[PDB]
């Protein structure tokens, strides 16, 4: 095992200790015989033998001994795995500077000894000469004589007391002569008692880097490395491809070039070449060294044969082969398959069809184990032969093994957590994976060409864990909001709507039926129609006991689906009186699941699906040409509008005429024909016999809400309005036509323009949604419910949204699911309707909604002040299940997934607006808040800006005479969040951000709970600044746990002096992971260059607490099952310690 991963600078001694031998010859392999070389990159003596238990030269190939070493050959006998864990080092004749600590964004070497980055580049390139150790003569230290005349002509002051060096040796000597304690003590005194105008910005960074280099234990001279280690000969393979043509990695080229340049420099130093040639050799060697690491900072190094740039070690870990999505996080998985999906109505809700071909391959080891235990086979090898020939007896074993083993099915674009749902496989013919019609709505994938992957859990614990945690029957409620996701999409809802409709004119009306069997028998004979006014006997059980089966007057279509409803109060035949709209049927599944259990809900959803399909297949839902009708008044409305628009053209300013003639004549005419066709379609025709002939197909499809809409029907039968050009404005030409009649090419060109614009818009906005989802998951990945109760009494006020005289969201729906912070009092009447701290159930919800009440203080995750993590007493009721959230459940990941789910359908607001709001950047130049009170004083005397107005006791929209108070919204739209949090409290900024995000998400018509936004806002604010110099002279931001831990320790050391308090600081979600504690979580999403070089000098040790670290290391995630197992291990360790204490 291993814990507390630590990363820091590697000294030359450590590099020599890691290496086994030094490479001197750049010879990969021989051309006649393919074997390793003596000192080449691929050496057996340095990187172990190539074969397993077989040394070279055919002397100790017996493989019986592993500790012997071949004398003549020179390599020991060892497995091939040792060739991957052996490294080599390269000796350098001259020192070279690291490319990461030189060309990075913050100049690490320039921060030391106050050296500009422009001057260090001149010394490394051997252009100028730096002077050190100055005497009484001129040319003081750090002179940096540029011209050579100053090095020779100006050097006429004696050959002593004057030292000048050039190249990497100068930087090495400067880093070796620099001191840490003296510089830190000098910077500490200068920081205190200083104006702090511009010198502080560099002094703080210098003090930080010095204190990091001091406590970390890394000397400053390790930056200029002297020896470079080589990767083992297993990550840069040279496997021969088919045909005799080898294929090596691009890493061998860099090492070969470095070795060649080093050998050339060594030969130059021995031959005593001139300084001009030796200098160029050192320059080329240093360039090769600092290009072998990054290859992007300096000039690009491209091979002469291939036209693509070489991939160095830095570029190999950034986006392509790094731990982002290639190897660490996202990797290939076996025991899986892929195939197209189809719809199956006979299958249950928890059963999915699986082809025999895929099941036979995925469950091969299970079939082998069954054949071994059943006794029908003998040797394992023999068994492998039985399934190969596909004997008929193996089919019985496959059906027995696949009985309760759940398989995981997931679509390609896994947006939300519902994309992965386990099922029970059932053998079926064909090659298409069967699926359930109700479960397809959760995956968000049509059956046109989509394909789904299948996985198989091998472990017994993982198999049993997916049955009670990831089964499709358990995922019936959406995690974003409490809305059922098993609502009928297209056909079941249409059938239920067709059955719910009641017509007064029908045969067999007025008769009384006791049982539904009599109704069915009458319908079989044809005496009674499908739906007509009928009084029958039905039981309701409203008093929670037994009912006398009171007679009810409803059509035969009604009370046939109502019989499937479970027996329970608050539900019955009274709820089926509606027209059974899609929204109504969706609301019906919520009440049945809320009142009764989960089994009744799933069984009712299964029963209603078959009835809807059986009823839809019996009626004439066929869409025809006569179903769509155009209003007869449109032919006159369009001609009247054309005649009216003619007079406007002859009158004409052309801009005003063209603008007013198109938004008044065509806009009013477009809405007139729309309502005309709507009234003509909604009208119920009366047949001569006296009964309704039939209902329109498109009208029913639009009213049910399954597929049809208002705009679609309007464009199909109406006038289509006016099209918009790609510039943005609307064309003045009237497109008066519909899809039923012919369309000329001119009016079709504008429609094509609009369609192409929409298609190009929808293709780019979806990538931004994925980027935002990937960015939000990394900032809220550390939020896990660890504690049950926190004991916090604080809370945030919650109010309902209102626009004018109507409310958008009810107060009961917004406050529902959260624990009440304080006891709410009934307005007017002195009665306590809710206790101080109690769970707000549906009964309490509609009780608070019935009696009018103002905002109530409710506990939230943002007001919690518990330990690391989040408690269950502030999150509230879970959204996936009715019961409260359990301990160990990941809240940040589900919140990020729910925030990213409604994306790709948005748009001054929308997706870019949400991305800018979450980042908390500068929206635009807005008036700063006055943050004053009482009398307001003038600002600045026209100094290009108004800094602040003091009252001790640009376009301006507020008068100086009027009084100003703290919190006045003297600002244009889109105010800045930084000054808002600086002046007002954190609760105000949180409420403002929540309101903005909720408005941006509701403008499109997507409901989202404010709990996820509150969790994201809490994850944003985690650092606090420092204003007092007590125990910490720095002013930079720090994690919230350090002052809570440092202030308690500082007060215990000495109460004297002064405390330390500072207001919190806000930062975007992107920078929230920049300064995170664990560098592994930051190196995954952000750039690996700035994260590694910054954490390398400081030497931060990762504790493997976050979820991202455990996934990379391959351990149990600290969430849910992992959290419970860790708690059990902790209690077991405590019990063991208690038992060992008594035993001494």
């Amino acid at each position: 095992t291993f814990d507390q991963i630590r990363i820091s600078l590697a000294s030359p001694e450590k590099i020599r200790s890691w290496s086994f031998g030094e490479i001197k010859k750049p010879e990969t392999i021989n051309y006649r015989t393919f074997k390793p070389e003596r000192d080449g990159l691929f050496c057996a003596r340095i990187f172990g033998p190539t074969k397993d238990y077989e040394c070279l030269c055919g002397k100790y190939k017996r493989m019986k001994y592993k500790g012997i070493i071949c004398e003549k050959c020179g390599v020991e006998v060892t497995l091939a795995r040792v060739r991957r864990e052996r490294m080599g080092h390269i000796e350098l004749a001259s020192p070279v500077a690291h490319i990461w600590f030189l060309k990075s964004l913050p100049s690490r070497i320039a921060m030391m000894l106050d050296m500009p980055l422009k001057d260090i580049e001149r010394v490394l390139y051997f252009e100028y000469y730096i002077v050190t150790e100055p005497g009484l003569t001129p040319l003081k230290q750090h002179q940096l004589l540029s011209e050579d005349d100053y090095m020779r002509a100006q050097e006429e002051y004696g050959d002593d007391s004057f030292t000048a060096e050039i190249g990497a040796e100068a930087i090495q000597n400067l880093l070796k002569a620099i001191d840490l304690e003296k510089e830190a003590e000098r910077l500490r005194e200068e920081l205190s008692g200083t104006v702090s105008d511009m010198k502080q910005k560099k002094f703080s960074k210098r003090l930080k880097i010095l204190e990091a280099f001091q406590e970390s234990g890394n000397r400053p001279e390790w930056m200029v490395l002297t020896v470079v280690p080589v990767i083992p000969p297993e990550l840069r393979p040279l496997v021969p491809l088919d045909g005799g043509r080898f294929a090596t990695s691009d890493l061998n080229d860099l090492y070969r070039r470095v070795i060649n340049r080093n050998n050339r420099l060594k030969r130059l130093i021995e031959l005593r070449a001139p300084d001009i040639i030796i200098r160029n050799e050192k320059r080329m060697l240093q360039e090769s060294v600092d290009a072998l690491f990054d290859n992007g900072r300096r000039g690009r190094v491209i091979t002469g044969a291939n036209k693509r740039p070489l991939k160095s070690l830095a570029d190999m870990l950034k986006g392509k082969q790094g731990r982002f999505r290639q190897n660490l996080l996202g990797k290939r998985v076996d025991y899986s398959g892929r195939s197209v999906i189809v719809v199956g109505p006979e299958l249950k809700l928890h059963e999915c069809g699986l082809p025999k071909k895929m099941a036979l391959e995925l469950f091969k080891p299970f079939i082998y184990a069954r054949l071994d235990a059943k006794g029908l086979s003998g040797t394992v090898k023999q068994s492998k032969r039985m399934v190969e020939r596909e004997q008929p007896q193996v089919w019985d074993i496959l059906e027995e093994v696949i009985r309760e083993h759940p398989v995981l099915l997931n679509r390609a674009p896994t947006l939300h957590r519902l994309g992965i749902q386990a099922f029970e496989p059932k053998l079926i013919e064909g090659k298409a994976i069967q699926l359930h019609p109700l479960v397809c709505a959760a995956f968000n994938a049509d059956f046109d060409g989509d394909q789904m992957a299948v996985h198989v859990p091998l472990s017994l614990e993982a198999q049993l864990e997916a049955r009670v945690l990831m089964m499709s029957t358990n995922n019936i409620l959406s995690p974003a909001n409490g809305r059922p996701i098993i609502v009928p999409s297209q056909d079941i809802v249409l059938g239920l709507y067709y059955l719910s409709v009641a017509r007064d004119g029908e045969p067999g009306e007025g008769k009384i039926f006791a049982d539904l069997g009599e109704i069915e028998a009458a319908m079989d004979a044809g005496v009674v129609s499908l739906h007509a006014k009928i009084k029958a006997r039905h039981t309701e059980m409203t008093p929670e006991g037994v009912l006398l089966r009171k007679v009810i007057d409803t059509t035969p279509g009604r009370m046939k689906i109502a019989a499937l409803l479970p027996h329970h109060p608050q539900i019955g035949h009274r709820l089926i009186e509606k027209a059974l709209t899609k929204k109504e049927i969706g609301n019906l599944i919520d009440i049945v699941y809320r009142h009764c259990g989960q089994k009744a809900t799933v069984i009712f959803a299964d029963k209603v699906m078959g009835l809807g399909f059986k009823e839809a297949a019996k009626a004439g839902i066929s869409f025809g040409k006569d179903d769509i009708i155009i209003p007869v008044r449109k032919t006159a409305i369009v001609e009247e509008t054309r005649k009216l628009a003619e007079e406007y053209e002859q009158q004409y300013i052309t801009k005003g005429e063209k603008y007013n003639k198109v938004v008044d004549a065509w806009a009013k005419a477009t809405d007139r024909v729309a309502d005309e066709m709507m009234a003509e379609l909604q009208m119920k025709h009366k047949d001569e016999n006296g009964r309704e002939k039939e209902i329109n197909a498109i009208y029913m499809m639009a009213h049910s809400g399954a597929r049809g809409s208002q705009a679609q029907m309007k464009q199909l039968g109406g006038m289509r309005g006016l099209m918009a050009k790609p510039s943005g404005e609307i064309i003045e030409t009237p497109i008066v036509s519909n899809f039923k009649e012919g369309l000329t090419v001119q009016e079709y060109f504008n429609s094509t323009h609009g369609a192409r614009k929409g298609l190009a818009d929808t293709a780019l906005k979806t990538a931004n949604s994925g980027y935002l989802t990937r960015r939000l998951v990394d900032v809220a990945q550390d939020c896990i419910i660890v504690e049950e109760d926190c004991g916090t009494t604080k809370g945030i006020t919650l109010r309902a949204v209102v626009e004018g005289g109507d409310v958008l969201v009810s107060l009961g729906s917004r406050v529902l699911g959260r624990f009440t912070a304080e006891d709410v009092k009934d307005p007017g009447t002195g009665e306590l309707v809710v206790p101080a701290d109690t769970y707000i159930d549906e009964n309490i919800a509609d009780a608070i909604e019935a009696a009018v009440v103002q905002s109530v203080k409710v506990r939230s995750v943002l007001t919690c002040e518990a330990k690391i993590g989040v408690c269950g007493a502030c999150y509230g009721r879970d959204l996936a299940r009715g019961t409260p959230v359990n301990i160990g459940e990941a809240v940040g990941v589900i919140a990020a997934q729910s925030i990213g789910e409604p994306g790709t359908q948005l748009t001054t607001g929308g997706l870019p607006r949400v991305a800018e709001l979450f980042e908390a950047r500068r929206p635009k130049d807005c008036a700063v808040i006055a943050e004053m009170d009482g009398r307001v004083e003038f600002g600045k005397d026209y100094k290009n800006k108004r800094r602040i107005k003091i009252t001790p006791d640009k376009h301006i929209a507020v008068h100086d005479g009027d009084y100003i108070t703290k919190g006045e919204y003297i600002i244009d739209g889109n105010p800045d969040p930084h000054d808002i949090l600086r002046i007002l409290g954190v609760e105000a900024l949180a409420n403002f951000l929540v309101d903005e995000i909720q408005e941006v998400y509701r403008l499109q018509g997507v409901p989202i709970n404010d709990k996820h936004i509150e969790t994201i806002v809490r994850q944003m604010l985690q650092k606090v600044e420092i204003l007092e110099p007590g125990d910490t002279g720095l002013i930079k931001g720090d994690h919230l746990d350090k002052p809570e831990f440092d202030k308690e320790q500082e007060k215990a050391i000495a109460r004297g002096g002064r405390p330390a308090v500072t207001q919190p600081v806000l930062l975007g979600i992107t920078k929230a992971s920049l300064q995170t504690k664990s560098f592994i979580s930051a190196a995954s999403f952000q750039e690996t260059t700035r994260v590694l070089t910054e954490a390398s000098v400081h030497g931060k040790t990762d504790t493997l607490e976050g979820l991202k670290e455990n996934v990379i290391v391959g351990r149990l995630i600290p969430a849910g099952t992992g959290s419970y197992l860790r708690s059990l291990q902790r209690v077991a360790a405590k019990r063991d310690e208690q038992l060992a204490q008594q035993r001494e």
Binding site: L460, E461, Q463, M471, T473, N886, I887, T1121, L1128, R1135
Partner: protein, 69 residues
């Protein structure tokens, strides 16, 4: 063949139930299942069905299994 409704009602954690059922199945793999019949069921399903009519506070054995080395 059995829902997790009664299982969640017995243990509201919904996470310890998985470990408890896994331990119950590991114990039923050899010399167990004297409380509820198989009824043509596998180990995990039979363990989940037995948990609905068994003592939920049986994690003492699971804790003692990893108590010492």
């Amino acid at each position: 063949r059995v829902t997790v409704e009664d299982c969640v009602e017995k243990v509201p954690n919904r996470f310890a139930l998985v470990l408890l059922s896994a331990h119950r199945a590991r114990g039923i793999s050899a010399g167990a299942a004297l409380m509820v019949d198989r009824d043509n069921d596998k180990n995990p399903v039979v363990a989940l069905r037995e948990i609905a009519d068994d003592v939920i506070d049986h994690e003492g054995l699971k804790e003692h299994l990893i108590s010492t080395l």
